[PDB]
Design a protein around this ligand. Structure first.
Ligand code: NAG
Ligand code: NAG
Ligand code: NAG
Ligand code: NAG
Ligand code: NAG
Ligand code: NAG
Ligand code: NAG
Ligand code: NAG
Ligand code: NAG
Lengths: 183, 322, 195
């Protein structure tokens, strides 16, 4: 509440210069980014707290009720510190001290272990990580498998000619029109 | 994140925002669909073949030079020199300023996997040809693929072998000139810079919009709560919340239009990759100015580059006809 | 096989099921915003005419009316964008029905994966389902090949086909099949000296 300024945030030491008459500091969006303490002169940098999205990696309700909460775009040390009574907006704080904490480029997937094998991507975590439900059952996260490597040969004299064929059929569903409506 | 953008960290604005109803749920549902479409665009543009072929150990492809395109072993990324320039020229504190509920989710396919896909596409077409797009890939010596690509022009095969070297020298000189010309012009990749600049300026305008008074006495929510008693205050905060709501809706609508444009471009790119590359096209002015021969995909930030090859008659002589 | 396939997996008709689902959700959320105050005393119309006095009765019912006009405007804009998407998709069916059905199209991976043979349109609720028939090679053998053959001091390029060899004899064959024939003048044309 610096000199009558009701605001919430984190106060840290700032090296920015102040002109002698200047007191406050402002950014492009008219948000106060610096103050001078009335009692003692100093440079303080107001920075907002940590925030980020939360998702749920759940299989079908039929299959099971084991989930895997992904905390997106946050430094992973915070949710250890977030383990407290009435110190986190989500109520299910008890899950924070849950299963194996894993680290990704997009965030921490609290509730799933990382296997080292590669399979097809079922549920995409983000930035090259995909989760799945596998069997003693659990949600496991791994790296995508673009496909099985194939090594086609090559030489100054080599041709590969097919000797047999298989007539195949496929399908291609396409919308053609939507529901007419009026108001 | 409406709550964080439209309203401040203050609790009071949250209830009034809830009173307006499901304005926000509609918005997140709208900007998630956009993200899914964005992922599927690259998924369908680059991943036509699901078998990841590997580059041949040696590079003696009948006198032709594929060094600038084929992966560079030196750098850990298989990005090749022409990709290395394209990545450098695109060049994409303001991101830190996005504390106001605005984020940029990462793409599902990282640059390494995109590079591997572009390497598979470009490493199957120099040893197999057009086959690997229809069924089982079959190898065929590379000089020969070319003479079964002249035959589609209307010129018999007795040109590429009969003058094998000159075509090789012309192709090498052409690829060098392409690299130099791409390096030169400041606006060769401009269009690509225009896309990212449009996105950046849209975000920047959306950030600056909350400084506007929007007909209210102030643009700071905490101060307007503190100085103004609540019954009158609700009017001014209604003005602010409505203004920022309209700004957010305008941003979402503009993003929808731009996403439709990008989706059309992505469909065209998929058609070009499945027609120019995996086969020889006979559509005039589709795969390059002239009689088309083949194509090379190359990755780039938020886009693709095609190196369309073509065959153009040169010196003419006139005669008498019956 | 097709009969069985669509009967087994339930995620096949996803495309046509998504359009009707989106329309149903849009209509449902449109007819659900009639019970929200939009920053007014109440969402009941005659109630908001009844209690509040005439000077600010409007300062409230204009709020309601412009809110509902904004909701209608949002629904209409969403429908214009969706209809543009459908029209983009609708013109990819007219072209497919024109080329794949009424002819044989040579555009790669347009009328199905592999070499195209024909197609069969079928109807479906608010859509269409094509049924492409394709020719896909499968079992392959690798032989030794040469660009040309010089016999009388002159080259001999293949008319239509490729020169292959099974280790003892040279043959000229087709490309997307295996049919060996003895190399003859009817399959070759000359293009100068073989040096
Ligand atoms: C007020 O605080 C300042 C800063 O420490 C000090 O210099 C000054 O003497 C104080 N005056 C009184 C009356 O406390
Ligand atoms: C769960 O199983 C029941 C009974 O077989 C079935 O009706 C329902 O569709 C299933 N739901 C899911 C999500 O698997
Ligand atoms: C969090 O910060 C620490 C301190 O620099 C760093 O070691 C760690 O890699 C960071 N983690 C993430 C996910 O950014
Ligand atoms: C046979 O092919 C290999 C593969 O590049 C090449 O290095 C070699 O020179 C070729 N042989 C002749 C005689 O050209
Ligand atoms: C080719 O494949 C078909 C597929 O079953 C098989 O029946 C046939 O025996 C194979 N060989 C020939 C020469 O058709
Ligand atoms: C291809 O070009 C590079 C760079 O100019 C050169 O180092 C390399 O030797 C060339 N290879 C061939 C086969 O010409
Ligand atoms: C066409 O050929 C004739 C002689 O054969 C020549 O006089 C005339 O200039 C030629 N046409 C052009 C446009 O040069
Ligand atoms: C066919 O390919 C295999 C594997 O590359 C090779 O071992 C074999 O020698 C090839 N056949 C001929 C006739 O060269
Ligand atoms: C190659 O084909 C000829 C044609 O009859 C046959 O006589 C010969 O045995 C074949 N050789 C091999 C190695 O298949």
């Amino acid at each position: 509440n610096f000199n009558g300024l009701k605001g919430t945030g984190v106060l840290t030491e700032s090296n920015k210069k102040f002109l002698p008459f200047q007191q406050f500091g402002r950014d492009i969006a008219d948000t106060t980014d610096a103050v001078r303490d009335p009692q003692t002169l100093e440079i303080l940098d107001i920075t907002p707290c940590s925030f980020g999205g939360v998702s749920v990696i759940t299989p079908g309700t039929n299959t099971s009720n084991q989930v895997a909460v992904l905390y997106q775009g946050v430094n992973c040390t915070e949710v250890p510190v977030a383990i407290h009574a009435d110190q986190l907006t989500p109520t299910w704080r008890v899950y924070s001290t849950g299963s194996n904490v894993f680290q990704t480029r997009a965030g921490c997937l609290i509730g799933a272990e990382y296997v080292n094998n590669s399979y097809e991507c079922d549920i995409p975590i983000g930035a090259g990580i995909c989760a799945s439900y596998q069997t003693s059952q659990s949600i496991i996260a791994y790296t995508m498998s673009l496909g099985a490597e194939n090594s086609v040969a090559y030489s100054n004299n080599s041709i590969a000619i097919p000797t047999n064929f298989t007539i195949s059929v496929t399908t291609e569903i396409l919308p053609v029109s939507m529901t007419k409506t009026s108001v | 994140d409406c709550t964080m953008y439209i309203c401040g960290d203050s609790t009071e604005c949250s209830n009034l925002l809830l009173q307006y109803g499901s304005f926000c749920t509609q918005l997140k549902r709208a900007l998630t669909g956009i993200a899914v479409e964005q992922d599927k665009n690259t998924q369908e543009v680059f991943a036509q073949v699901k078998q990841i072929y590997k580059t041949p150990p040696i590079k003696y492809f009948g006198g032709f030079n594929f060094s600038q395109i084929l992966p560079d072993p030196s750098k850990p990324s298989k990005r090749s020199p022409i990709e290395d320039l394209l990545f450098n020229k695109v060049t994409l504190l303001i991101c830190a300023q996005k504390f106001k509920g605005l984020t940029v989710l990462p793409p599902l396919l990282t640059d390494e996997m995109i590079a591997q896909y572009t390497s598979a596409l470009l490493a199957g077409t120099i040893t197999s040809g057009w086959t690997f797009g229809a069924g089982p890939a079959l190898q065929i010596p590379f000089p020969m693929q070319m003479a079964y690509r002249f035959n589609g022009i209307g010129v018999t095969q007795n040109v590429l072998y009969e003058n094998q070297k000159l075509i090789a020298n012309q192709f090498n000189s052409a690829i060098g000139k392409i690299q130099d010309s791409l390096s030169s012009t400041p606006s060769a990749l401009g269009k690509l810079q225009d896309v990212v600049n449009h996105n950046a300026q849209a975000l920047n305008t959306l950030v600056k919009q909350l400084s506007s008074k929007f007909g209210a006495i102030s643009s700071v929510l905490n101060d307007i709560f503190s100085r103004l008693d609540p019954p009158e205050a609700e009017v001014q905060i209604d003005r602010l919340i409505t203004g920022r709501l309209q700004s957010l809706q305008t941003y979402v609508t503009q993003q929808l239009i731009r996403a439709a444009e990008i989706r059309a471009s992505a469909n065209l790119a998929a058609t070009k990759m499945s027609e120019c590359v995996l086969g020889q096209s006979k559509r005039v002015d589709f795969c390059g100015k002239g009689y088309h021969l083949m194509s090379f995909p190359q990755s780039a930030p938020h886009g693709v580059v095609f190196l369309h090859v073509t065959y153009v008659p040169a010196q003419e002589k006139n005669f008498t006809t019956a | 096989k097709i009969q069985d396939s669509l009967s087994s997996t339930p995620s096949a008709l996803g495309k046509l099921q998504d359009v009707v689902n989106h329309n149903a959700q849009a209509l449902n959320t449109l007819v659900k915003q009639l019970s929200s105050k939009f920053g007014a005393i109440s969402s009941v119309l005659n109630d908001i005419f009844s209690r509040l006095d005439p000077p600010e009765a409007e300062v409230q019912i204009d709020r309601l009316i412009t809110g509902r006009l904004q909701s209608l405007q949002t629904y209409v804009t969403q429908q214009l964008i969706r209809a543009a998407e459908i029209r983009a998709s609708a013109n990819l069916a007219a072209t497919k029905m024109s080329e794949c059905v009424l002819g044989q199209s040579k555009r790669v991976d347009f009328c199905g994966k592999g070499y195209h043979l024909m197609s069969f349109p079928q109807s479906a609720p608010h859509g269409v389902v094509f049924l492409h028939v394709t020719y896909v090679p499968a079992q392959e053998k690798n032989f030794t090949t040469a660009p040309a053959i010089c016999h009388d001091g002159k080259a001999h390029f293949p008319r239509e086909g490729v020169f292959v060899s099974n280790g003892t004899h040279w043959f000229v064959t087709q490309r997307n099949f295996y049919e060996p024939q003895i190399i003859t003048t009817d399959n070759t044309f000359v293009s100068g000296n073989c040096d």
